[PDB]
Amino acid sequence: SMLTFREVVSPQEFKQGEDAEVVCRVSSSPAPAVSWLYTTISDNRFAMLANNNLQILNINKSDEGIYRCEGRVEARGEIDFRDIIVIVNVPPAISMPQKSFNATAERGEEMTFSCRASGSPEPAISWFRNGKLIEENEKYILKGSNTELTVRNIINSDGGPYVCRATNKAGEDEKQAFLQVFVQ
DSSP states (O other), X not given: OOOEEEEOOSSEEXXXXXXXXXXXXXXXXXXXXXXXXXXXOOOTTEEEOTTSOEEETTOOGGGOEEEEEEEEETTTTEEEEEEEEEEEEEEEEEEOSOOEEEEETTSOOOEEEEOEEEEESOOEEXXXXXXXXXXXXXXXXXXXXXXXXXXXXXXXXXXXXXXEEEEETTEEEEEEEEEEEEOO
């Protein structure tokens, strides 16, 4: 008969752009009246479903926060609540402002490619050459959480594309830069 919150998982994670359903399973006898707070909610994308869950259409990163599921046994003036942390994951999106680079072979030249990514959780950035993971050594320098790849001692075989990939639990992005190598 008393308010029981059987399922109020926190946090609950959702992918940006999905129609999120925030789950709150609360029971009592008589059945509970349920309201959601974040102060009461009054937005066009927000609505309570028949099962009392909170729907957030087209959920956005900015919707992230603490939402309160409140149950009331109105017959007995009993009111209880649980707070649920809503997290919004955002797939990576790479910024690679320059995609075309030139260098001249066999002059000791180096070139740095830049790749930054937005996303949540923080995307891991890796570079690939011919589909193979590039690791730091005498030829390749990686700086700034792998956002800057430097190719050292450029020769002809360094010409062609280099790919940066940005990955998190919500997705992956990739962009391709090309190095043109001239003969002296």
